[PDB]
Amino acid sequence: DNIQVQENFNISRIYGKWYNLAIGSTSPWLKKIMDRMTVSTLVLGEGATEAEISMTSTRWRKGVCEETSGAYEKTDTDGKFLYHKSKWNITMESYVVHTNYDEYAIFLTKKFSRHHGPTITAKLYGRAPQLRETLLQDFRVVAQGVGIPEDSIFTMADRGECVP
Ligand code: NI
């Protein structure tokens, strides 16, 4: 199951703050800990170079509020990004599969392995912490569409944002 970006993807309009609201994955590990996950925040912006997109993600992982900063590279395909550190053995591609910029975005991430085929992870983001069931429904057909089982899709509890 091969993956297409949102048409006419407009990168400057994806910048700013988002809330992770729903998640699914083919990963077994994620399925066990997909419950214990709550609403996280993602900030996106222009990178150090023109060829990067900077990003910061803030989460509850057990006790601590984690603030994770990373940087993806743009590719030749608008709305498709790459994070690659070969030495660490890490290769992930993520795709903005659908977004209307000012309300929601749906990301699909492929994380690659030497030992099995990629983990496919789907994340739904809102510009607001609040869901809207009808979006959740579409998010499900998107995730199932790329092979994420009915189970393995979870909605996240909103427990607010956290300074670390
Ligand atoms: Ni290995």
Swiss-Prot record:
PTM description: Proteolytically cleaved in the presence of oxyhemoglobin or MPO. The cleaved form t-alpha-1-microglobulin lacks the C-terminal tetrapeptide LIPR and is released from IgA-alpha-1-microglobulin complex as well as from free alpha-1-microglobulin when exposed to oxyhemoglobin or erythrocyte membranes. The cleavage of IgA-alpha-1-microglobulin complex is associated with the reduction of the covalent bond between IgA and alpha-1-microglobulin, yielding an intact IgA molecule. The cleavage by MPO is associated with the transfer of heme group from MPO to t-alpha-1-microglobulin.
Annotated compartments: Secreted; Endoplasmic reticulum; Cytoplasm, Cytosol; Cell membrane
Induction: Up-regulated upon oxidative stress. Up-regulated in keratinocytes upon exposure to heme and reactive oxygen species. Up-regulated in hemoglobin-perfused placenta.
Bilayer topology: Peripheral membrane protein
Disulfide bonds: C65-C162
Free-text tissue specificity from the UniProt record: Expressed by the liver and secreted in plasma. Occurs in many physiological fluids including plasma, urine, and cerebrospinal fluid. Expressed in epidermal keratinocytes, in dermis and epidermal-dermal junction (at protein level). Expressed in red blood cells (at protein level). Expressed in placenta.
Residues carrying sugar: N10, N89
Amino acids binding 3-hydroxy-L-kynurenine: S27, K85, K111, K123
Assembly, per entry: Monomer. Homodimer. In plasma, it occurs as a monomer or dimer and in covalently-linked complexes with immunoglobulin A (IgA), ALB/albumin and F2/prothrombin. Chromophore-bound alpha-1-microglobulin interacts with the constant region of immunoglobulin A. Chromophore-bound alpha-1-microglobulin interacts with ALB with molar ratio 2:1 and 1:1; this interaction does not prevent fatty acid binding to ALB. Interacts with F2/prothrombin (via N-terminus) with molar ratio 2:1 and 1:1; this interaction does not prevent the activation of prothrombin to thrombin.
Purpose: Antioxidant and tissue repair protein with reductase, heme-binding and radical-scavenging activities. Removes and protects against harmful oxidants and repairs macromolecules in intravascular and extravascular spaces and in intracellular compartments. Intravascularly, plays a regulatory role in red cell homeostasis by preventing heme- and reactive oxygen species-induced cell damage. Binds and degrades free heme to protect fetal and adult red blood cells from hemolysis.
Protein name (database record): Alpha-1-microglobulin
Species the sequence originates in: Homo sapiens
Positions spanned in the full protein: 27 to 190 of 352
